[PDB]
């Protein structure tokens, strides 16, 4: 993919420019020196876009043309078998209930509720991860 990488490179360039400009303009001309709270956010949003763009760049350099990236193409090119898309599942609502229990137990300071919520989150996430890998029962 060539255009996504270019988008992220544009964003990273602008963010780095803005971060450096803000840092050096608040080093002077400011009440107490460098501002130290917007500077950090700016360098690390630059780092975010940089990470994403670099990953996309490597994947693009390690890839041959794709029917999506390619113009000139027809629908007989993508004829094949896509991945695995999960049909019906009921684990998400249980995960959300467990996380909400832990959150309300953290709002009102109740340690037992926090412990129960964490245990339920571990259980529900385990159920979600193993859903399509449990084998038949051994009897």
């Amino acid at each position: 993919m060539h255009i996504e990488a270019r988008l992220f490179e544009i964003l990273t360039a602008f963010f780095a420019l803005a971060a450096v400009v803000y840092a050096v303009l608040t080093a002077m001309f400011a009440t107490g020196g460098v501002e130290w709270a917007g500077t950090t956010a700016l360098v690390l949003t630059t780092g975010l876009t940089l990470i994403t763009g670099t990953f996309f760049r490597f994947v693009a350099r390690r890839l041959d043309t794709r029917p999506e990236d390619y113009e000139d193409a027809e629908i007989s090119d993508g004829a094949g078998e896509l991945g695995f898309f999960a049909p019906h599942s009921w684990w998400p609502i249980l995960i959300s209930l467990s996380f909400s229990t832990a959150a309300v137990g953290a709002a009102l300071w109740l340690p037992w509720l926090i412990a129960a919520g964490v245990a339920f989150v571990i259980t529900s996430v385990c159920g979600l991860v193993f859903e399509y890998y449990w084998g038949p029962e051994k009897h």
């Binding site: 896509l82 695995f84 999960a86 038949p136």
Partner: protein
Amino acid sequence: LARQAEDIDTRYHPSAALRRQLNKVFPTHWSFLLGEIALYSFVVLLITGVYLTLFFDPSMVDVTYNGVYQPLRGVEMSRAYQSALDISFEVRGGLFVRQIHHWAALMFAAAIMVHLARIFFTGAFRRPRETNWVIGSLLLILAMFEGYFGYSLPDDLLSGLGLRAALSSITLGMPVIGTWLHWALFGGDFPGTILIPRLYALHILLLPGIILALIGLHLALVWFQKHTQFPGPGRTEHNVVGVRVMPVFAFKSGAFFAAIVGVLGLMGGLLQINPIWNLGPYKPSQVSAGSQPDFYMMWTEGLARIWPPWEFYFWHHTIPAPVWVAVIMGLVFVLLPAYPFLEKRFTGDYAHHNLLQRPRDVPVRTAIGAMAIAFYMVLTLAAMNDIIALKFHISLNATTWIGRIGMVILPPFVYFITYRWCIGLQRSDRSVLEHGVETGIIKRLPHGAYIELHQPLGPVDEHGHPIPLQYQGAPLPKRMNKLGSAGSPGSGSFLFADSAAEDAALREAGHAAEQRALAALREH
């Protein structure tokens, strides 16, 4: 031991009843152990209570403590409270034993309730078994009252408040008999001298005896009317498919017994229940904030809390409010044992039944049961008003009114949702019967179309679509991995692999044995 076995055989010659009992077949469903749980809890209760009777003194005479527990020295208390304190602090391992006793009582009640839920929802109470249902209901009532009389024995402040309020002042208010019952039971006015010995005699001798007789009768009826079963591949109304007692079933039952005893010991050692020393001896002038009976009487307490103050005053007389609680509790206790006859009168079905129903195939009964469970949960939560309003910052009057209104609007809402949910499950089953099992794989079909690659459960027609099956009351698979689709991991241990020959041989013999089991059970 040939000599001993033969001499037993010429003196008794059973040799045929033993063979008839060693070949009995029992179905193997995880849901058929919820009664074993209650049975094992009862056994543990018997053992620990027999241990406890060697140290308890059930008197109501007053003494001064003069013991080892210092923050209570010089306080005047009854003899039962002092005996309980002596069990707790002066016998090596007594606190552990009474904590096991209380935890086992709680597990007894909970297991009974879960077992009743199973029996009701699967429909195992129909024509041949109404009387067994009735015996079970009586056992439930007796267990409730036995636990109550039990935790009211070491008379401290909480037990005293419970006794006073419930027993004394609800028996005192009955319309005509009333005070006569109160004086026959207490020997006089509320704080007497014969209450605790009478409760002790009722609790260690009478109710355990009645419960033991009823449990014997229950298990006999279950043994001679063979167990029910779920519909399946080789199951009919005329046979029992499972495992014989001889090698397997006794083994599984004993292992389950040991595991339940282990759980009870662990949670009787690690969690604290009923610390009577933090309380004080019962005195009619002081009170605390919790109140609260054990969780199997909380519905009675909640019903007393959220019932409005409706009294009737006519000529020279008075009918107080707790009369309402009395008739409602009696109505519940009368409507529980008489349900199978009501259902057979209303549906008009009087045939023998040995195959169970899935709860999704009977929407109306499932909705009724869900409504009753919602009602019970509302009544139980209305009993911990103080704790809820204190921990979660809610008004107290707010919780009272929430319970008072929920008592009317939650059951019907639950009924509606449960009915619609059951029918939705039925439709989801019919869809996988008509088509195949969804695999989750997508294709693009060169003229840009997306299909999803179902997998048939039976034969197929000329153009690849499966011919629809018929429903047979048995569950259907929904995930491709539950059918053998992606399996067979390596055959190492956890970090080092085995040889290839061993892996191939084990995999291949396992596959063969699976196929043979399937083909054998189909054909019968």
